[PDB]
Design a binder for this molecule. Structure first.
Ligand SMILES: O=C(O)[C@H]1Cc2c(O)noc2CN1
Ligand SMILES: O=C(O)[C@H]1Cc2c(O)noc2CN1
Ligand SMILES: [Cl-]
Ligand SMILES: [Cl-]
Ligand SMILES: [Cl-]
Ligand SMILES: [Cl-]
Lengths: 260, 258
């Protein structure tokens, strides 16, 4: 019986530093949707755990050259962590190297704009050059565009991959700042969950426009064939059925939203 | 070597083709799950036979005998190799069979005859003039049975004892019931079918309010079945290729009737 090492990522509102973090230690340093979820999962499954922020601050991709996995996925693949509890998208390529619970939350790639930006759809973005647009420099959204056979998305990708200066960002926060500071000349492609969160935060100058480009989910991830998998999956299903997940979403997204 | 698929007659997931009486085997059927089965079969490299579950149920454990019925029973008792249907992923089922990651999202929803003065579950629970129920078996009924949420528990205590029965054997009967009850019956069912029916003639029903929960349908296999892994990767590949979105638009394609 050992302490479970949880890899996660500093991404609001899933995991955030508490106000007095500088005088706090261990799990108490952090707060958020995934901090609450880790607590609920640990309890229903009966384990102790340590929250650790992934070192490279990444979600998880395989370098094409070295073939090494980075991010939280790499943490699991190379045995640095026992479980990942984070807004980590279930994808085919990931499912080939790690296990995922059934989804604890749904999302889709979405478009964030500065209020007043004349854009309603991915098709609008694709037909113009005045407003620039990009995605997270890594992760499942970038990979969606790189791999898409759908004409509109492929056209967006061919623009994005070669835009100068770079339209990609290192973090969600950077994407948000870029939309906010660009006077309507930048739109950010990101998962609907983050988009809806930011829409509820001061200065309330962003919004999600149009439908989602796809439909997918976040799953709790474990090393392939890990014994923890089964219990965590059942825990996620129980929590969903009790309404606890809906409660958590409301708590961190809307309950104390700052935009009325 | 021929995979046996248990599925269920449920529009627009699986439906009898026009002139099916002269058709044979898999060609008797059409719909979202028929296309999905074909796609899954192609990606996993197997031949298959579609079979309509004998008792016409999704799957529940009998309280007395503790025997599983419906499509879940078919997998649990070795009658089928895989279930490809709008079968809801639930904790209780996940304990006895395996599920792929979801191929479709849904939630429990409210169907009313147009003009009914109801906008939400809370409304229903606060009145008695308009009756309401669910399928006499399946995950929607179980949802209300198990719920500790105030409004939903109140709805359940009403529905379980209401006279005559507010439960129906098939979705078609629930829908017929809403249509024929002049606004005196509301039907609780999953959002996917609600939205489908809303766009079909006579265009006299509608979904009202948001969904009561959020869950998904998964392709099911007997517990620990080998087929499980391949089928899950296939579902994920189909999603990422946009094939699942294509199938949804095809079968919920709005011709305009409503
Ligand atoms: O799992 C993943 O790769 C990432 C990608 C992503 C994004 O683009 N916006 O938000 C997120 C969180 N999930
Ligand atoms: O899987 C299941 O038990 C059933 C339940 C249900 C319902 O109530 N309306 O539609 C359905 C399909 N899923
Ligand atoms: Cl409990
Ligand atoms: Cl292919
Ligand atoms: Cl029952
Ligand atoms: Cl009683």
């Amino acid at each position: 019986n050992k302490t479970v090492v949880v890899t996660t990522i500093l991404e609001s509102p899933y995991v955030m530093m508490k106000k007095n973090h500088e005088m706090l230690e261990g799990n108490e340093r952090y707060e958020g949707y995934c901090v609450d979820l880790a607590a609920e999962i640990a309890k229903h499954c009966g384990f102790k755990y340590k929250l650790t922020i992934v070192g490279d601050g990444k979600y998880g991709a395989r370098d094409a050259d070295t073939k090494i996995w980075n991010g939280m996925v790499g943490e699991l693949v190379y045995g640095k962590a026992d479980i990942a509890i984070a807004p980590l998208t279930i994808t085919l390529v990931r499912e080939e190297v790690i296990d995922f619970s059934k989804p604890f939350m749904s999302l889709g790639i979405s478009i964030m704009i500065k209020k007043g930006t004349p854009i309603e759809s991915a098709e609008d973005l694709s037909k113009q050059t005045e407003i620039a647009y990009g995605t997270l420099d890594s992760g499942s959204t970038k990979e969606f565009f790189r791999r898409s056979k759908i004409a509109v998305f492929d056209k967006m990708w061919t623009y994005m991959r070669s835009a100068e200066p770079s339209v990609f960002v290192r973090t969600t926060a950077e994407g948000v700042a870029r939309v906010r500071k660009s006077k309507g000349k930048y739109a950010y492609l990101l998962e609907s969950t983050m988009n809806e969160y930011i829409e509820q935060r001061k200065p309330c100058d962003t919004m999600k426009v149009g439908g989602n480009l796809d439909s997918k989910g976040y799953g709790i991830a474990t090393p392939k064939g890990s014994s923890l998998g089964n219990a965590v999956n059942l825990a996620v299903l129980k929590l969903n059925e009790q309404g606890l997940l809906d409660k958590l979403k409301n708590k961190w997204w809307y309950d104390k939203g700052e935009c009325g």
